[PDB]
Each structure stands twice: as structure tokens, then as C-alpha cells.
Design a protein around this ligand. Structure first.
Ligand SMILES: COc1cc2cc(c1OC)OCCCOC/C=C/C[C@@H](C)OC(=O)[C@@H]1CCCCN1C(=O)[C@H]2C1CCCCC1
Length: 128
């Protein structure tokens, strides 16, 4: 599966290099420019828990997901991962609980020590 490809071949994009966020680019985006901290960011995504028990998509809501990069408005893995993406790119992220919801989790939706996979498409990013 898509997760196992990332676990195998996938780029370690953490600063500490602890394999905590792993990345494969699936469709290459456009321009040399990736977003700066603070940028307003527009994505579509699909996401799941590795346990296969929960799934979530921006499409279930019929619209892009929007947030300010690097404000901790998402999990650390998104602030890291999306910062590496070009306009128009689709990537896969596989994420250790340390860069998601950790030992506490976020019950009931996310258990203690959960691993998460996302597919992300970066639609646009505008400046603060
Ligand atoms: C544990 O809570 C949730 C987790 C996730 C989605 C949740 C959610 O309920 C608040 O609602 C769906 C719409 C997003 O609501 C706005 C804020 C999200 C920010 C924050 C909670 O999440 C994140 O940063 C990440 C990345 C951005 C997309 C959502 N994501 C999630 O962790 C998903 C999660 C993904 C795995 C399957 C279950 C849901």
C-alpha cells in the first residue's frame, strides 16, 4: 500500500532525522517557490490512521482546507511537510505519533501513540 512505499523509500524530512515524517512526491508542482512561515495555505487532503479505523477528507466538506503555515494550527508534521511542497504538488506523508498527537492522542478520534498517513495536494499559498 501507499503507506508501505513511504515507510520503505520515503524521504526523511525531519531536522533531527528521526524518521518521524516521511515524504514521497506523487505529482510534481510548479515554480521553484515553496511557502514561507506564516503564508496562508490552501490544500485538499485525504488522511487516515494506520489502524484503518478512521478516515478524513477535505472533500467530505466540499472545499479546500485552509491554514497559516507554521502557527501550530495543524500537527507538527503538516507545518514541516507542506513547507516543502510546490504549488500544484501531490505528496504522501507517513507520520510517527511524535509529529502528530503523541502519547496522549486526541480521544476518541485519535488513539494514544497513533501513526497517520496523508495524501496532500497544495493548491495555492498567499502571503500574510
Ligand atoms: C483530532 O481532531 C481532528 C483530526 C483530523 C480532522 C478533524 C479533527 O477534529 C477536529 O476534523 C476534520 C476537519 C478539520 O478540523 C479543523 C482542525 C483541524 C486541525 C487538527 C485537529 O488536525 C490536523 O492538524 C490534521 C492535519 C490537517 C487535517 C486534519 N488533521 C487530522 O489529523 C485529521 C485526522 C486525520 C487522520 C484520520 C482522522 C482525522
Amino acid at each position: 500500500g501507499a503507506p508501505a512505499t513511504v515507510t520503505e523509500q520515503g524521504e526523511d524530512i525531519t531536522s533531527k532525522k528521526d524518521r518521524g515524517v516521511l515524504k514521497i512526491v506523487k505529482r510534481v508542482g510548479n515554480g521553484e517557490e515553496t511557502p514561507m512561515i506564516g503564508d496562508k495555505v490552501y490544500v485538499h487532503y485525504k488522511g487516515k490512521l494506520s489502524n484503518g479505523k478512521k478516515f478524513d477528507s477535505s472533500h467530505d466538506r466540499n472545499e479546500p482546507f485552509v491554514f497559516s503555515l507554521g502557527k501550530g494550527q495543524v500537527i507538527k508534521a503538516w507545518d514541516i511537510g507542506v513547507a516543502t511542497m510546490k504549488k500544484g504538488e501531490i505528496a504522501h506523508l507517513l507520520i510517527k505519533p511524535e509529529y502528530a498527537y503523541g502519547s496522549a492522542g486526541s480521544l476518541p478520534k485519535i488513539p494514544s501513540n497513533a501513526t497517520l498517513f496523508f495524501e496532500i495536494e497544495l493548491l495555492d499559498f498567499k502571503g500574510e
